[PDB]
Design an enzyme around this catalytic site. Structure first.
Site, PDB file in Angstrom:
ATOM      1  CG  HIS B  46      21.889  34.150 108.283  1.00 56.70           C
ATOM      2  ND1 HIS B  46      22.507  34.697 108.335  1.00 56.70           N
ATOM      3  CD2 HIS B  46      23.616  32.880 107.421  1.00 56.70           C
ATOM      4  CE1 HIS B  46      24.001  34.923 108.335  1.00 56.70           C
ATOM      5  NE2 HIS B  46      24.038  33.883 108.010  1.00 56.70           N
ATOM      6  CG  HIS B  48      17.660  35.177 111.133  1.00 52.47           C
ATOM      7  ND1 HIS B  48      18.122  35.680 112.145  1.00 52.47           N
ATOM      8  CD2 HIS B  48      18.048  34.593 110.168  1.00 52.47           C
ATOM      9  CE1 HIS B  48      19.121  36.110 112.009  1.00 52.47           C
ATOM     10  NE2 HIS B  48      18.998  35.802 110.526  1.00 52.47           N
ATOM     11  CG  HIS B  63      21.798  32.084 112.944  1.00 54.24           C
ATOM     12  ND1 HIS B  63      23.275  32.100 111.080  1.00 54.24           N
ATOM     13  CD2 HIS B  63      21.581  34.044 112.568  1.00 54.24           C
ATOM     14  CE1 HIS B  63      23.695  33.085 111.959  1.00 54.24           C
ATOM     15  NE2 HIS B  63      23.056  34.105 111.564  1.00 54.24           N
ATOM     16  CG  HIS B  71      27.502  31.244 112.288  1.00 54.85           C
ATOM     17  ND1 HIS B  71      26.334  31.114 111.279  1.00 54.85           N
ATOM     18  CD2 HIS B  71      28.099  31.373 111.084  1.00 54.85           C
ATOM     19  CE1 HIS B  71      25.879  31.713 110.090  1.00 54.85           C
ATOM     20  NE2 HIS B  71      27.296  32.132 110.023  1.00 54.85           N
ATOM     21  CG  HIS B  80      23.221  28.074 113.669  1.00 55.93           C
ATOM     22  ND1 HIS B  80      23.766  29.540 113.341  1.00 55.93           N
ATOM     23  CD2 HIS B  80      23.796  27.181 114.874  1.00 55.93           C
ATOM     24  CE1 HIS B  80      24.259  30.182 114.386  1.00 55.93           C
ATOM     25  NE2 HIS B  80      24.396  28.760 115.380  1.00 55.93           N
ATOM     26  CG  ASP B  83      24.360  28.665 109.874  1.00 59.43           C
ATOM     27  OD1 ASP B  83      23.672  29.985 110.013  1.00 59.43           O
ATOM     28  OD2 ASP B  83      25.447  28.123 110.642  1.00 59.43           O
ATOM     29  CG  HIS B 120      22.543  38.967 107.474  1.00 62.63           C
ATOM     30  ND1 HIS B 120      22.297  39.489 108.420  1.00 62.63           N
ATOM     31  CD2 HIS B 120      21.877  38.135 107.108  1.00 62.63           C
ATOM     32  CE1 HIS B 120      21.858  39.011 109.311  1.00 62.63           C
ATOM     33  NE2 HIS B 120      21.189  38.095 109.034  1.00 62.63           N
ATOM     34  NE  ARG B 143      18.368  40.470 112.581  1.00 64.77           N
ATOM     35  CZ  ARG B 143      17.857  39.468 112.624  1.00 64.77           C
ATOM     36  NH1 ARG B 143      16.567  38.894 113.192  1.00 64.77           N
ATOM     37  NH2 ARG B 143      18.962  38.367 114.186  1.00 64.77           N
TER      38      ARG B 143
HETATM   39 ZN   LIG Z   1      24.141  30.340 111.757  1.00 61.63          ZN
HETATM   40 ZN   LIG Z   2      21.140  36.648 109.587  1.00 61.17          ZN
END
Ligand SMILES: [Zn+2]
Ligand SMILES: [Zn+2]
Ligand SMILES: *[Se]c1ccccc1C(=O)NCc1cccnc1
Ligand SMILES: *[Se]c1ccccc1C(=O)NCc1cccnc1
Ligand SMILES: [Zn+2]
Ligand SMILES: [Zn+2]
Lengths: 153, 153
Positions: B46, B48, B63, B71, B80, B83, B120, B143
């Site tokens: 993702h 962020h 995010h 999401h 997002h 994403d 992640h 993370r």
């Molecule tokens: Zn997201």
């Molecule tokens: Zn994330």
């Protein structure tokens, strides 16, 4: 009202956090924070062109110079946008940074987001060293620590 | 014509290099590179919101979600901006990344430069996990590595 941050890392450890804040797009940027692990004395302090640290600080390229000027000190009209002069480390190896600059910005084509901040081995001679390199890099030597300049909360 | 890059590092052995290229501001972004040190299987991937690594990947915040959506996965309308789904690590812990995405951008509006890319611990369930957190984070866990997305040559 715009805030940006950079975490500097390299061997020693040389490590630092530098914050940038700009109240409005037409205004100066305040730069503040701390770098530790440095030799006592001056260390060149520059925004470099590429936010590319894939092979360490070398991939950051030359000084951030969007207006195609020669290298200078922060107070000079003839400078690169990324020319933030030197930071000064004390006997304990810590440089506490407190700069205001009117040439960098956090908006527009002087914007430093996504570029790399670098702290150097030696002093930046601010284009007063009398050699070819002086008006390009300031003869500040190796790159001790760097980081990409990111958007903060 | 616009290229940006991100070096992923974290607390553990997970490390990676991710490139983004966009030919035109209205066009899709190609994402490619490799991440190593992962467990075999899917890992959430993702952008962020903050390019802030002050205290590690946690300071990157939530995010990147400028348009206030839930999401989802990269192929969903409901997602997002940040994403990008999952990357997949092989038996050797290497994820070879190859993504084309229409929603992220490297210029114009809401671009990802100066934000943080994060890989992640667990799979992103792409908003199809059946709990509240699914529609927020995708339940992708800690993370493992992250980096600020910077301008490349
Ligand atoms: Zn997201
Ligand atoms: Zn994330
Ligand atoms: Se200023 C700048 C330089 C390079 C890439 C992106 C930007 C930018 O302005 N991003 C938008 C932004 C900046 C600060 C806070 N929030 C959004
Ligand atoms: Se990439 C991006 C997203 C949102 C807002 C601003 C930007 C941006 O790139 N701004 C910096 C800039 C603007 C014009 C020319 N050069 C750099
Ligand atoms: Zn330099
Ligand atoms: Zn310079």
């Amino acid at each position: 009202a715009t805030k940006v941050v950079c975490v500097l890392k390299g061997d020693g450890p040389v490590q630092g956090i530098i914050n940038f804040e700009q109240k409005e797009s037409n205004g100066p940027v305040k730069v503040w924070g701390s770098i530790k692990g440095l030799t006592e004395g001056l260390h060149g302090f520059h925004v470099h062109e590429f936010g590319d640290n894939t092979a360490g600080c070398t991939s950051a390229g030359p000084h951030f110079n969007p207006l195609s000027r020669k290298h200078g000190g922060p107070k000079d009209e003839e400078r690169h946008v990324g020319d933030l002069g030197n930071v000064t480390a004390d006997k304990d190896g810590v440089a506490d940074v407190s700069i205001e600059d009117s040439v960098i910005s956090l908006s527009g084509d002087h914007c430093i987001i996504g570029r790399t901040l670098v702290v150097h081995e030696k002093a930046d001679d601010l284009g007063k060293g009398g050699n070819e390199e002086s008006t390009k890099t300031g003869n500040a030597g190796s790159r001790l620590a760097c980081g990409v300049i990111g958007i903060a909360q």
